[PDB]
Structures are given as C-alpha cells and as structure tokens.
Amino acid sequence: DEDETTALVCDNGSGLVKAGFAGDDAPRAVFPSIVGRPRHQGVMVGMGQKDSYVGDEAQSKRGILTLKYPIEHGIITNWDDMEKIWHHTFYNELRVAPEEHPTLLTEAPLNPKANREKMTQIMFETFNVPAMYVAIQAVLSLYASGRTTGIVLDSGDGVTHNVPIYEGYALPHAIMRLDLAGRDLTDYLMKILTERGYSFVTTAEREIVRDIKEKLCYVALDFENEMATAASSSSLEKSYELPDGQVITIGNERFRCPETLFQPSFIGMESAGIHETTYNSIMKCDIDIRKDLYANNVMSGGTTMYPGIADRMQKEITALAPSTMKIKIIAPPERKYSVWIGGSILASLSTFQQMWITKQEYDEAGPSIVHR
Amino acid sequence: LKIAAFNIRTFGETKMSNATLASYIVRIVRRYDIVLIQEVRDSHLVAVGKLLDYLNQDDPNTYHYVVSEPLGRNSYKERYLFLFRPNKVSVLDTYQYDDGCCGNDSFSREPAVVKFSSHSTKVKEFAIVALHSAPSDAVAEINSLYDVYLDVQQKWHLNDVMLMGDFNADCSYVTSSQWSSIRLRTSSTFQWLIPDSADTTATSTNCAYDRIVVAGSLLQSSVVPGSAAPFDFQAAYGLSNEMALAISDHYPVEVTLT
Amino acid sequence: MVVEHPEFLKAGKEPGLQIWRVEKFDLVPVPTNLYGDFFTGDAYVILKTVQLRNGNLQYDLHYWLGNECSQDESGAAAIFTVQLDDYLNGRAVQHREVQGFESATFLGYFKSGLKYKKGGVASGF
Ligand SMILES: Nc1ncnc2c1ncn2[C@@H]1O[C@H](COP(=O)(O)OP(=O)(O)OP(=O)(O)O)[C@@H](O)[C@H]1O
Ligand SMILES: *[C@@H]1O[C@H](CO)[C@@H](O[C@@H]2O[C@H](CO)[C@@H](O)[C@H](O)[C@H]2NC(C)=O)[C@H](O)[C@H]1NC(C)=O
Ligand SMILES: [Ca+2]
Ligand SMILES: [Ca+2]
C-alpha cells in the first residue's frame, strides 16, 4: 500500500505524455507534450497572470502562445520545459505530491548516458521523490504482450524504432531509427488533401486533418493494385463533416497517406521502409536467434493503429525473408499504450520493490548509480 | 480617454486572414484607448493572436488584453475581448459573472467585468461590465444587469461602473412596452448615454442595439457630453456598401471620458 | 540485482522441478502434488534444474500462459522469468509456452500427464 497503490508510471512521447498509477488498465492522464509561452501580455477573465501553460491549455490557446516541443524525435531536448511537464503531471493531472510516490519513467531506445542521469538528477533533487527507475519504451511493449524475446516496432508521433530483444535484454547494436511518424503523415495528408482540391486554412481545419487521418486512413496492401480499385470510382470513398455544416469526400489519399511508411520517397526521403527496416534490424543480430524475431514481431505506438498494417508487414517481410521461415506480426489493440501498460505492470510487481534506486542510493553514489 | 464597444460579426480566423479587412479592423482599434470586441468566434485564439501582432509589432506593449473562455449555453459559443492601452489605463481585477451555471441561468453569455485604473481622468478607478445579449432574452438579460452592478457593490464597493455592449436593446427585440420591467432603465441610478434615437447598425435599418450605460456620480461627471455616440466607419473612410458590411453589421458605440 | 524474495533463494539449488503461479503481481509455490494442473485463466512459471556431467547445473526456464487469462498475469510471467535468468547469472535459456501448443521438452517434464482446467485467480488491475 505504501508502494503498491502509491506507485506511478509515465511514458514520455514526442506527441503525447501518458501517465498513471501502478496497476491500472489505462493511464489516468494522456495529454500532449507541449509548453505554450504567451506572446502578448494579458489575462483570462477570472484568472491573474500566467507565466506559461502546459498540456491541453497550451493546445487550446495556441494562437496567442508560442508552443515549444521538449521531446524532439523521442529524446528530451529542452530540460527546463520538460521539468514543467512533469510538474503539471504530478500536481495538475494526477493530483499527487511526488515526495511520497515512487516514480517510474520511460526512455527512448538509444537514450545517451547523460540523458538518463540528467532526468535522474531532476526527479530526486528538484521534485524530492522517494524512489524512481528508468525503463525502456520498447522493452515494456514486449513485456506488455507477455514475452521476453522478439522485435518491437514502436512508431509514435516523433520517431519509429525497431528494437530487437532477446531474453529481456535489448540489442542496441541492432536497433534501427527512422525520423517519420504521426506528425509527418498528418503533414503529408494536409498537403495531398489540399492538392486534391480542398483547403485547410483555419485552426478548425488544421486540427481536424489529424482527426481524419486517425479515423479514416487505412494501410492498403498491394498499393499498385489498390489504385486500380480507386480508379474504378468504387465505394472506397468516405465522407466526413467539419465543425461547421460543410462536408468533404476522401478518396485515394485515404490510403496514400500511410503508404509513406512503406515508401519513404513519397515525402522525398531516400531511406528504407518499415518492412525493410524490420528485415535489416533482424539481419544485424545473431543468426541463431532470427527465427524468434520473425515469429515474435510485436507492434507498439500510435502510428501503427492503421488498419491492414499487420497484413502489409506480413506480406512484405515474408516476401523479403526466407521461404521456409515462420513469420507472425502481433498487434494488440491497446498498442498505443503498450509502453505504459508494460511499465504499469513492471512497477506493481513484488519483485520490482528492490529495483527502485532510492534516495539512499542517490545520496551516496550520486546520479551515476542508475546508469547500470 | 477613448472607450468603445464594437460588435464584430463572425470575428473568426477567416475574417482576420483577409488582409483588406484586417487593415481597417486594427485601424479602428487604434482609435481607442480601451476597446471591447464581441462575437469573437475563435476556438484557439489565432485571430486574437494575429490582431495583437499587428497592434504590438512596433511596440510590444502598445495594447494588453483581457479575454474569456467561450461562453454560451446554446452550443455555439463566443468570447468577450478587451484591448486596452497599459500607459493610459491599467486593469486591477477581472472576473466572470456567476449567475448559477440548472435551469435558472439568467444569461446566455455571462458578462465579463473588469476593474480599471485611469489616472488621467476624474474617476481614478471604475468598472466596465461587457455584455452581448441573446436577442431572445434581450430584456431578461438587460434586466439582470442591475444585479451584476449590485454584485459589483458587494465585491469592490465601486459605485462607478460602465455597462456597455451589443444589448440588442431596441426595435423588435425590445419594444416600448418591454422597458417597464427592466430595472436598469427604470431606476434613476443609471444614465443611458447611447439614446433610443441612435442607429448602431451598419445596415440601412435604424436600431440602437449597441448601448453604453453609466452609473455612479463621479463616472457620470467624467463623461464629455456630445461624445457618447456611434462611429460610421462607412462614411468615415468613404467605404462602399458591401465593403462596410463585409467588416461588420454593428457600429462601434464610443464615448470620451475626462 | 540484489533480489531477496523467499522463492528465489529456494530456486535452482538442486535437481528436480519447481512451479510458481502468478498471483496478483507475486509468485506462489504450487503444492508438489498438484503439479501438472493448470488453470486456463492464469499464467505460470516453471524451472527445470537438470544435473550435468561436469558437476555443474543446467536451468531451463518455461512460462506457461493461460488462454482466458488477463494481461497482467501474462506480462508478469515474462518479467519474473527474465529476473530469474539474471539471478542464475544468465545461465538459463527461456522458453515461451502457450496453452495447447506446448513445446517438445515442456510436455516431457510431466510424467503423470498434463491436465488443464477452468478457473484461476483474479487479475491485479
Ligand atoms: N488510431 C490511430 N490511427 C492512426 N494514428 C494514430 C492513432 N492514434 C494515434 N495516432 C498517431 O500517433 C501519434 C501518438 O502516438 P504515441 O503516443 O504512440 O506517440 P508518442 O509516444 O507520443 O511519440 P514517439 O513514440 O514517436 O516519441 C499521434 O501523432 C497520432 O497521429
Ligand atoms: C476580403 O473580402 C472582401 C469583402 O468580401 C473582398 O472584396 C470583395 O471581393 C469579391 C471577390 O472575392 C468581389 O466580388 C467584391 O466586389 C469585393 N467587394 C467589394 C464590394 O469591394 C476581398 O476580395 C477580400 N480580400 C482579398 C484581397 O482577398
Ligand atoms: Ca512512445
Ligand atoms: Ca486470472
């Protein structure tokens, strides 16, 4: 009870920042990773002066504010801003003081030595937490699906990462990185949908194009032949209405948007697709453990939720990998919280009670103790 | 001291995006020290942000602001927006009126009250209750303003208060017989500057919808007579009919204090 | 790795077979007589300690996952298995075992036969 129901977990995403208690189904709070700074001097009716806003308030009043993004491509860039995000998370979101609540944090796959120790130094000295731990985002996702071996594909808002794992330990030497995700596809949708003929001028257009992407877009396997289907004026269209009474029709662009994940040349990038990344990610591992990775191909993050994605990967890697190889793409329906879910479990274990690198370890060994 | 209450029809992002229109909106705003804009349909304060950019481009502190969250039980909300010069005057306290929210919520859009500090006038400190009434309860909401003022007396003990905005307080919405019930008009405490004669509509129609009430002896004395009236920007800048209407349908009811 | 949980110290000392069931974020040793009985709504963890020719030991980590079980128990089963492997100095090869689709060796441990059953302890969420 002192550490069971008082424990906390937090996923640190480029887009959203998930947070909650140890042993919950879903995170209690899911807000955007934003820090809005006011451009002009003024106040809201009722309130007084505001140095800065965080989360939804920053999002909902972004016209008068200058929004900064602390987590650039999965990794923490601005520490001063990220400090306020946790402050908002502790007090404003969860309504809990940090000094009597163990705090679990998640780090991106290849987070540098300094970045681990810097956030460790923050939590203990600036927030005065009793104990904490820094888990990996891709690892929790593998544990969330209930296993200790296989390759994970965490694709959120900022970046995409193929993370081979064997016996619990991740394989850094085989990790692949790709700088394209939720915010990029939306920005591509925005441009191909205006190119269709429509116009997204105001904030009500600019914000809803993301909502469209999430609800309507789908990963259509065999893109070559999917155009012939769309070229037959079939009922693969899908109408959708704005805040006002103005309707819109989405055709080809409905599936040409997530196809960029498999064709980087769409957005002008001269890199490899998610299917090739997954193949080359495995190819940079030991030969005696590839069979496990092919069969245990887990999926995580928000930008994997597009329907027909498993189907698309399955066909590609099986068409690229060996013939006699057994491939299986797994994608739990709660994969947009895989990172958090795994940590929520991890922290609530009885055996995890001793993994907490408490202030006792901090006072003596300093910030270098949790480095491992 | 130049004050003004200006209802801008469909004050959204598509409005400000127009360079031709935007030009004249900021130009009008620069005429007054304090300005109260109404029908602000800006979900994310981009247009409000844009307006502030043109005004404070040379000097960051040309105009400060006071805005509220979107108000409206009708599922179609808008904001009250004050643009005031910090040098000429300064805000001391601001609060949203609490009518109840139920079923007893007297207002569609709860008036935003602002306490000011004008050292360059007879009245050093005075309140400014802003209100854009729903045409349906034009009378009910105008009648409830008396309570708003009565509440200002329980809060700041400031008898000097200016109640201004698009009251929709004339013609079809508030006819002759309907003034009887309104305690604002009946009680001698108040002094209606904008008269029934006035035409606060950019259209050809003749209605004194935009109003400027004033209470408190000191405040009433601060006002310059023959100054409290609208501002025909169509005839002022020599605009065509569609040009003028393209901006807004209501005129700005101004007044000069001293 | 300074784990001092009661079950860890008893584990991997001598040749035999050891079973633990995931009971609300914690391991509990199954009675020796009930071995070979698994609730379809729970997750289990097994450890086969085999004696070697050189005098040293051999550890095989197997985690049996239920069909109608919850995510917390399925996940925990993977977590504990990794913490044990590390407790044994990384000298064990883990094995993922599903209900109905058991491996070659896993089926071989039970000399009295494998018997499933409906039920299981509730989730920890
Ligand atoms: N159902 C959905 N369909 C398609 N895209 C989605 C869906 N849900 C979320 N997304 C996209 O995923 C992004 C958020 O996902 P997630 O929270 O996994 O990313 P993150 O962890 O915040 O950032 P990263 O992991 O890249 O550092 C958003 O940009 C959104 O567009
Ligand atoms: C901003 O809006 C104004 C007012 O609607 C536009 O002026 C009108 O433009 C339309 C075509 O868009 C013409 O048919 C009208 O003759 C114009 N109104 C009058 C009477 O002058 C203006 O085009 C917009 N600004 C810009 C530069 O796009
Ligand atoms: Ca993430
Ligand atoms: Ca169970």
Name residues whose C-beta falls within 8 Å of residue B85's C-beta, 6 or more positions apart in sequence.
Answer: B33, B34, B62, B63, B64
For chain C, domains (ranges, CATH) are: 1-125 (3.40.20.10)
Whether residue A350 and residue C26 make contact (CB cut-off 8 A), yes or no, is: yes
Question: What are the backbone angles phi and psi of residue C101, rounded to the nearest 5°?
Answer: -110, 55
> How many of the other CB atoms lie within 10 Å of CB of A87?
15
Report the amino acid identity of residue B11. Answer: F
The answer to whether the Cα torsion of B26, B28, B29, B32 is positive or negative is positive
**Catalytic one of B39, B132, B250, B254:** B132
- The position carrying tokens 């032949």 is A225
> Do residues C45 and C22 touch, judged by C-beta distance below 8 A?
yes
Closest CA to A135 of A111, A154, A158, A152: A111
Alpha-carbon distance of A132 to A22, in angstroms, equals: 13
Considering A68, A91, A117, which residue would you say is the last residue of a domain?
A68
Closest CA to A80 of A111, A41, A45, A37: A37
Please give the C-alpha separations between residue C48 and each of A232, C52, C92, in angstroms, as whole numbers. 61, 13, 10
Closest CA to C97 of A146, A96, A93: A146
User: Quick one: residue C32, left, alpha or beta (phi over 0 = left, psi -120 to 50 = alpha)?
Assistant: alpha
Whether residue A147 and residue C96 make contact (CB cut-off 8 A), yes or no, is: yes
Alpha-carbon distance of A181 to B11, in angstroms, equals: 35
Alpha-carbon distance of B188 to B169, in angstroms, equals: 18
Residue A295 lies in a domain: yes
Alpha-carbon distance of A296 to A74, in angstroms, equals: 24
Task: Using CB atoms within 10 Å of the CB of residue C124, give its burial: 0 to 12 exposed, 13 to 18 middle, 19+ buried.
Answer: buried
> Do residues C27 and C20 touch, judged by C-beta distance below 8 A?
yes
Verify that A167 and A220 share a domain, yes or no.
no
Residue A279 lies in a domain: yes
> Do residues B115 and B82 touch, judged by C-beta distance below 8 A?
no
The helix-helix angle for A182-196 and A208-216 (nearest 10°) equals 100
- The position carrying tokens 């009565």 is B150
> Do residues A106 and A339 touch, judged by C-beta distance below 8 A?
yes
CATH classification of the domain holding A128: 3.30.420.40
Closest CA to C78 of C93, C65, C87: C65
Cβ of A335 closer than 6 Å to ligand 1, yes or no, is: no
**Catalytic one of B39, B78, B141, B254:** B78
> Which residues of chain A have a CB within 8 Å of the CB of C74?
145-146
Per DSSP, what are the bridge partners of residue B255? B3
Tokens read off for A7: 């424990």
Name residues whose C-beta falls within 8 Å of residue A103's C-beta, 6 or more positions apart in sequence.
Answer: A8, A10, A123, A127, A129, A131, A132, A133
Closest CA to C16 of C60, C55, C65: C60
Verify that A284 and A177 share a domain, yes or no.
yes
Alpha-carbon distance of A111 to A83, in angstroms, equals: 17
Please give the C-alpha separations between residue B93 and each of B48, B125, B155, in angstroms, as whole numbers. 21, 11, 11
CA-nearest residue to B46 within chain A is: A63
Whether residue B45 and residue A62 make contact (CB cut-off 8 A), yes or no, is: yes
Count the alpha carbons within 13 Å of A156 in the hemisphere toward its beta carbon.
29
Closest CA to A59 of C71, C104, B43: B43
CATH classification of the domain holding A261: 3.90.640.10
CATH classification of the domain holding A44: 2.30.36.70
> Do residues C65 and A336 touch, judged by C-beta distance below 8 A?
no
Residue A214 lies in a domain: yes
Per the structure, how many domains does chain B have?
Answer: 1
CA distance A199 to chain C (A): 44
Annotated binding site of C for Ca(2+): 41-42, 73, 85, 90, 92, 121
> Which residues of chain A have a CB within 8 Å of the CB of B50?
63
Number of residues that this document lists for chain A: 372
Alpha-carbon distance of A237 to A252, in angstroms, equals: 8
> Do residues C125 and C70 touch, judged by C-beta distance below 8 A?
yes
Task: Using CB atoms within 10 Å of the CB of residue A127, give its burial: 0 to 12 exposed, 13 to 18 middle, 19+ buried.
Answer: middle
Closest CA to A300 of A261, A339, A327: A339
Name residues whose C-beta falls within 8 Å of residue A252's C-beta, 6 or more positions apart in sequence.
Answer: A227, A230
3-state secondary structure of A255: helix
Task: Using CB atoms within 10 Å of the CB of residue B147, give its burial: 0 to 12 exposed, 13 to 18 middle, 19+ buried.
Answer: middle
Number of residues that this document lists for chain B: 258
Alpha-carbon distance of B116 to B124, in angstroms, equals: 8
C94 interface with A at CB cutoff 8 Å: yes
Tokens read off for A299: 């999926």
Residue A224 lies in a domain: yes
The helix-helix angle for A137-144 and C71-87 (nearest 10°) equals 120
Verify that A13 and A116 share a domain, yes or no.
yes
Alpha-carbon distance of A347 to B21, in angstroms, equals: 58
Closest CA to B113 of B97, B132, B98, B92: B97
The answer to whether the Cα torsion of A139, A144, A149, A150 is positive or negative is negative
Closest CA to C106 of C75, C74, C70, C63: C63
Report the amino acid identity of residue A120. Answer: T
Q: Residue-wise over B228-245: b if at least 16 C-beta within 10 A, else e?
A: bbbbebbeeeebeeeebe
> Do residues B111 and B129 touch, judged by C-beta distance below 8 A?
yes
Most distant CA atoms of chain B, gap in Å:
51
Tokens read off for B61: 């502190």
Resolution in angstroms comes to 3.9
CATH classification of the domain holding B21: 3.60.10.10
Question: What DSSP line would sit under A78-91, residue for residue?
Answer: -HHHHHHHHHIIII
Question: What are the backbone angles phi and psi of residue B178, rounded to the nearest 5°?
Answer: -75, -15
> Do residues B184 and B190 touch, judged by C-beta distance below 8 A?
yes
For chain C, the helix, strand and coil percentages under 3-state DSSP, each to the nearest 5: 25, 30, 45
Closest CA to A186 of A207, A206, A213: A213
Alpha-carbon distance of A304 to A210, in angstroms, equals: 15
Considering A44, A68, A92, which residue would you say is the last residue of a domain?
A68
Tokens read off for A13: 């995403």
> Do residues B70 and B79 touch, judged by C-beta distance below 8 A?
yes
- Distance of alpha carbon A357 from its chain centroid, rounded? 26
CA angle, corner C115, sides to C109 and C121, nearest 5? 105
> Do residues C124 and C24 touch, judged by C-beta distance below 8 A?
yes
3-state secondary structure of A151: strand
Alpha-carbon distance of A95 to A72, in angstroms, equals: 27
For chain A, the helix, strand and coil percentages under 3-state DSSP, each to the nearest 5: 40, 20, 40
Between strands B125-130 and B161-166, the pairing is parallel
The terminus-to-terminus CA distance of chain B in angstroms comes to: 6
Chain B touching partners, 3 or more CB pairs below 8 A: A
Per the structure, how many domains does chain A have?
Answer: 4
- Reported as type and span, the H/E element at residue A326 is none
Residue A26 lies in a domain: yes
Alpha-carbon distance of A250 to A215, in angstroms, equals: 12
Closest CA to A34 of A20, A16, A12, A8: A16
> Which residues of chain C have a CB within 8 Å of the CB of A147?
78, 96
Residue A309 lies in a domain: yes
Q: Residue-wise over C8-25: b if at least 16 C-beta within 10 A, else e?
A: beebbeeeeebbbbbbbb
The parent domain of residue B148 ranges over 1-258
Closest CA to B246 of B24, B98, B60, B74: B24
The helix-helix angle for A338-348 and C71-87 (nearest 10°) equals 60
The parent domain of residue A275 ranges over 136-181+271-332
Most distant CA atoms of chain A, gap in Å:
71
Residue A204 lies in a domain: yes
The answer to whether the Cα torsion of B189, B194, B195, B196 is positive or negative is negative
Report the amino acid identity of residue A261. Answer: L
Verify that A93 and A105 share a domain, yes or no.
yes
> Do residues C6 and C90 touch, judged by C-beta distance below 8 A?
no
Verify that A284 and A141 share a domain, yes or no.
yes
Cβ of A301 closer than 6 Å to ligand 1, yes or no, is: yes
Report the amino acid identity of residue C108. Answer: G
- Reported as type and span, the H/E element at residue C27 is strand C27-29
Name residues whose C-beta falls within 8 Å of residue A15's C-beta, 6 or more positions apart in sequence.
Answer: A32, A33, A156, A157, A158, A181, A182, A183, A302
Question: What are the backbone angles phi and psi of residue B207, rounded to the nearest 5°?
Answer: -140, 135
> Do residues A185 and A303 touch, judged by C-beta distance below 8 A?
yes
Name residues whose C-beta falls within 8 Å of residue A293's C-beta, 6 or more positions apart in sequence.
Answer: A149, A150, A151, A164, A282, A285
Q: Where are the beta strands (DSSP E) in chain A?
A: 8-12, 16-21, 29-32, 35-38, 42-44, 53-54, 65-68, 71-72, 75-76, 103-107, 132-136, 150-155, 160-166, 169-170, 176-178, 238-241, 247-250, 297-300
Considering A240, A267, A294, which residue would you say is the last residue of a domain?
A267
- Tell me, letter by letter, the H, E, C secondary structure of chain B: CEEEEEEEEEECHHHHHCHHHHHHHHHHHCCCCEEEEEEECCCCCHHHHHHHHHHCCCCCCCCEEEECCCECCCCCCEEEEEEECCCCCEEEEEEECCCCCCCCCCCCCCCEEEEEECCCCCCCEEEEEECCCCCCCHHHHHHCHHHHHHHHHHHCCCCCEEEEEECCCCCCCCCHHHHCCCHHHHCCCEEECCCCCCCCECCCCCCCCEEEEEECHHHHHHECCCCCECCCHHHHHCCCHHHHHHHCCECCEEEEEC
Tokens read off for C80: 């504990």
Alpha-carbon distance of A296 to A328, in angstroms, equals: 6
Per DSSP, what are the bridge partners of residue C27? C22
Which of B40, B41, B46, B91 to probe by mutation at the A interface, max A CB count within 10 Å?
B46
* Centre of ligand 3 from the C-alpha of residue A11, in Å: 6
Tokens read off for B240: 């065509």
The terminus-to-terminus CA distance of chain A in angstroms comes to: 28
Q: Where are the beta strands (DSSP E) in C34-118?
A: 37-39, 44-51, 57-65, 92-98, 115-117
Name residues whose C-beta falls within 8 Å of residue B6's C-beta, 6 or more positions apart in sequence.
Answer: B28, B35, B36, B37, B38, B210, B248, B250, B251, B252, B253
Count the alpha carbons within 13 Å of A140 in the hemisphere toward its beta carbon.
31
The answer to whether the Cα torsion of A303, A309, A314, A315 is positive or negative is negative
> Do residues C90 and A167 touch, judged by C-beta distance below 8 A?
yes
> Do residues B202 and B224 touch, judged by C-beta distance below 8 A?
no
